[PDB]
Amino acid sequence: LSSVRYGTVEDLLAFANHRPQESGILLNMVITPQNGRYQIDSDVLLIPWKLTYRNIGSDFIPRGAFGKVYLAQDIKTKKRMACKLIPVDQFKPSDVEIQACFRHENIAELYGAVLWGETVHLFMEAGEGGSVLEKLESCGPMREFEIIWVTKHVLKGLDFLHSKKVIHHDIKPSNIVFMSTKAVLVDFGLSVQMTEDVYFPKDLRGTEIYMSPEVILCRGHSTKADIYSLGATLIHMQTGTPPWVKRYYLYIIHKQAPPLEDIADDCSPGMRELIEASLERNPNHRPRAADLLKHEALN
Ligand SMILES: Nc1ncc(-c2cnc3ccccc3c2)cc1-c1n[nH]c(=S)o1
Structure with a gap:
């Protein structure tokens, strides 16, 4: 060319x-x-x-x-x-x-x-409209409605990617950018398409704060890794500050997981149930993007 x-x-x-x-x-x-x-x-x-x-x-x-x-x-x-x-x-x-x-x-x-x-x-x-990180940094904690709105868009992006056996590997406020009608997922630099039921990584990939324990352990993971990252993104969207940062990261995350203590007192029981479900330590017990879309907090 x-x-x-x-x-x-x-x-x-x-x-x-x-x-x-x-x-x-x-x-x-x-x-x-x-x-x-x-x-x-x-x-x-x-x-x-x-x-x-x-x-x-x-x-x-x-x-x-x-x-x-x-x-x-x-x-x-x-x-x-x-x-x-x-x-x-x-x-x-x-x-x-x-x-x-x-x-x-x-x-x-x-x-x-x-x-x-x-x-x-x-x-x-x-x-x-900018990134979800820019809104949080310039304004502070988002309102429950804006959180529900953004999450329903990200979840529709992840359900599609995971149906194509693709792990984004970097779901964070910074990689969720938005327009007037929707929000899009960005940065596929660390993305990978699964050839088998379990992905075995050669090196640790992603952002420490939003990394799942199975990813930090490097023993093996799947599309469920993005669900934990979304849960970590949710607690950042809800509180206005990322998890771990206020209380205290690879050593702290591998021992303490999930950071359920970082969820604000203001949080609704519906959203708290969604955040706690997405942050489940066992990847097998953690819900799929398709499952979370059906949750009471979003619909
Ligand atoms: N398609 C995009 N659209 C928008 C952004 C963006 C991000 N932050 C902002 C903050 C403040 C104001 C505007 C912003 C816009 C990033 C991209 C992008 N694509 N690939 C990667 S990585 O970044």
Whole structure:
């Protein structure tokens, strides 16, 4: 590939596994190339993100160390997309694989991938309302209704991913971004598709605070790992502060689990039953995303 052209998922995945010019594969017709190119200020305009609860704007949102998300607008279709910049050295096929193959209303759609210089630009669905972490940080504890609303979206994302035998591996407030009508799941960098009933990891993956005990133990886990992470995300959404942090992490988590003490006194018995169910230590006794959607607290 020497130019930016429209292609299939198979073309995108082949490019991902594979001189000042730009090359790449566009999956959605929303991204407009002109003469096998996609240049800034000529084809796409990089607009700032709106920090709703801060009355200011931001050119980009920092995502770890080897990631920054910009807000791009296709000058032709006027379509707003998020633009994630991942350097070639730190670029993994997992960053495109799940989003290219599996499309769902509650998974941020990958529109295209463009390599320019030493960085890979991933154009995808822009959560213009921001991340669940941004709301919590700028406002504090969320209201029970907003919690129920967001969770019903995430659970519909996870039920789909787990039906495809996929473990996200990083469900946290930071990876739940939202729009006016819905919330989408982001960051598939640590994602993995299960080949068997149990997944055996080679290294510890995820964010310590939201990690399940079975993940920290490294003996074996499944899609149930995401359910615990959602429970940990829920206690952060409910209290406004992440679990463990207030009381006190790998040693503390492997011994004490779940952090049921971190659940606020204000919490409703319905939501508390949902949070406690999702945080169940035994993965076998922990509910599926499909099961939790049927819970009284959500419906
Ligand atoms: N598609 C996206 N849409 C939105 C965001 C985002 C995150 N935080 C914000 C905070 C404050 C304001 C806006 C925000 C927007 C991140 C992405 C994204 N995709 N892949 C990864 S990793 O990040």
